[PDB]
Amino acid sequence: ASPPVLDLGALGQDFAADPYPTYARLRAEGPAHRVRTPEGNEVWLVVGYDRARAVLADPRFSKDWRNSTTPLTEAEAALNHNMLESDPPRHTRLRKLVAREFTMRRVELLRPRVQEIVDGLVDAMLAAPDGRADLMESLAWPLPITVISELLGVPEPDRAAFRVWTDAFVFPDDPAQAQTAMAEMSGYLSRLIDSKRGQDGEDLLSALVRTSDEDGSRLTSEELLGMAHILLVAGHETTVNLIANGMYALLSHPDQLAALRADMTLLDGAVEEMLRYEGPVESATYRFPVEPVDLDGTVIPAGDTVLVVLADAHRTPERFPDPHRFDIRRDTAGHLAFGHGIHFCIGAPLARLEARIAVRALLERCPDLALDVSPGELVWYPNPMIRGLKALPIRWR
Numbered sequence: 423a424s425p426p427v428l429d430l431g432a433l434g435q436d437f438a439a440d441p442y443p444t445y446a447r448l449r450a451e452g453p454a455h456r457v458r459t460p461e462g463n464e465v466w467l468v469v470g471y472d473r474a475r476a477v478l479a480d481p482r483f484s485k486d487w488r489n490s491t492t493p494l495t496e497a498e499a500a501l502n503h504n505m506l507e508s509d510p511p512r513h514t515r516l517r518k519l520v521a522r523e524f525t526m527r528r529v530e531l532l533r534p535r536v537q538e539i540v541d542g543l544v545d546a547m548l549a550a551p552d553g554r555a556d557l558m559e560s561l562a563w564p565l566p567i568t569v570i571s572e573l574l575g576v577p578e579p580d581r582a583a584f585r586v587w588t589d590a591f592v593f594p595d596d597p598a599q600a601q602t603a604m605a606e607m608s609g610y611l612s613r614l615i616d617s618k619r620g621q622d623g624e625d626l627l628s629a630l631v632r633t634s635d636e637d638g639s640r641l642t643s644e645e646l647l648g649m650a651h652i653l654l655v656a657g658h659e660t661t662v663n664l665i666a667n668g669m670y671a672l673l674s675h676p677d678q679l680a681a682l683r684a685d686m687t688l689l690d691g692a693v694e695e696m697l698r699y700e701g702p703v704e705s706a707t708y709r710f711p712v713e714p715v716d717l718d719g720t721v722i723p724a725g726d727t728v729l730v731v732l733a734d735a736h737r738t739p740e741r742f743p744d745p746h747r748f749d750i751r752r753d754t755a756g757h758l759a760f761g762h763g764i765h766f767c768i769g770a771p772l773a774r775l776e777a778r779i780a781v782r783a784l785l786e787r788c789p790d791l792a793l794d795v796s797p798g799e800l801v802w803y804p805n806p807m808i809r810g811l812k813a814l815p816i817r818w819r
């Protein structure tokens with residue numbers, strides 16, 4: 423169990439479009455499997471709902487790179503001093519710095535402005551005289567980048583760069599491009615950081631700079647970079663792809679769409695079922711076991727790289743009966759789309775606010791809303807960590 427049993431790159435775009443038969447085939451063989459990912463990394467996948475849930479929570483699985491046998495590349499080593507790539511105590515201190523910002527009740531205060539963004543976006547989209555636009559271009563991309571940039575203080579002219587950068591390190595065309603995108607991003611962000619110093623800004627990045635400058639032990643210049651990185655990315659493509667993936671899932675299931683429209687109180691569950699069925703985090707961020715870990719006979723060496731395949735947990739039928747059915751009334755509680763345990767998503771209330779407002783906006787404002795593409799005209803990314811589409815063509819009357 424040391425060369426990979428499968429090269430996911432080799433399976434081409436059919437794996438990208440529909441990875442679930444691959445993972446379910448693995449599950450039927452066991453909990454853990456050595457694979458080569460499309461970008462060339464050799465890693466272990468963890469499959470099946472109970473094992474996935476347990477590995478997510480398990481402190482035998484570190485997220486700290488000093489526990490990884492694979493070293494960080496130069497560009498990645500700029501950025502790793504972030505909460506998601508730490509264990510306690512560092513994780514504990516870093517999450518405390520921004521916790522207050524992202525509670526349900528603080529994020530609720532952003533409702534008028536989020537609603538405002540969505541309303542103007544849907545307004546501009548609906549101007550198309552033919553009744554056809556791209557929902558990714560018109561809504562799903564522009565909304566989250568706007569909201570997070572205003573929170574942090576990223577000037578409007580600088581926002582376009584991030585789609586380009588973050589695209590390159592999700593679907594790298596080649597291993598180099600994703601490293602160079604990473605470098606430019608970190609450079610931009612260090613320049614952004616320095617530009618806040620002494621300017622008395624009221625934004626999140628401005629507060630963090632002052633915290634860092636007041637006591638470097640409390641937040642170091644490296645941690646400030648990594649924090650800015652984490653908040654911009656782990657939010658980015660995730661929230662953008664939640665909204666496009668969930669709207670694709672609802673528009674491809676006309677029975678469900680009709681039901682939601684008929685009873686808009688189904689909205690919250692509809693967004694939960696979107697996360698369950700086609701959540702953006704197909705596999706959780708890397709875990710490194712700190713000692714050999716035995717998973718039903720399959721031993722992962724200490725220090726190897728472990729992806730927990732959240733997407734496969736969500737299709738496990740013992741936990742989610744009739745799991746291939748998109749059903750906005752199912753009980754979704756216990757899904758893993760926001761993780762589980764001490765790393766559970768901190769942006770989860772913001773993500774929910776965004777996706778809820780966007781989804782309801784589209785339903786109320788686009789009569790006869792439907793996909794304007796044939797199922798196989800769509801293009802998904804190969805990367806097993808993120809589930810996402812390039813375009814989502816839609817139409818309305």
Ligand code: HEM
Binds near residue numbers: 478707766
């Ligand atoms: C629908 C959109 C989102 C999804 C699906 C998502 C998913 C996740 C998941 C699965 C994790 C845990 C990863 C792991 O254990 O390996 C995570 C953690 C995290 N998320 Fe999100 N997230 C989303 C939105 C956001 C937003 C909008 C923000 C920030 C403004 C954000 C910030 C973070 C951060 C900082 C962590 C690190 C938490 C920690 O280590 O304690 N996320 N997210």
Ligand SMILES: CC[C@H]1OC(=O)[C@H](C)[C@@H](OC(=O)CN(C)C)[C@@H](C)C[C@@H](C)C(=O)/C=C/[C@H]1C
Binds near residue numbers: 502506660
């Ligand atoms: C779960 C939510 C996101 O996780 C992250 O932000 C991780 C921590 C990021 O990796 C690093 O920083 C790497 N480190 C060694 C510096 C992102 C950039 C990983 C990538 C697949 C992405 O663009 C999408 C990432 C999401 C899956």
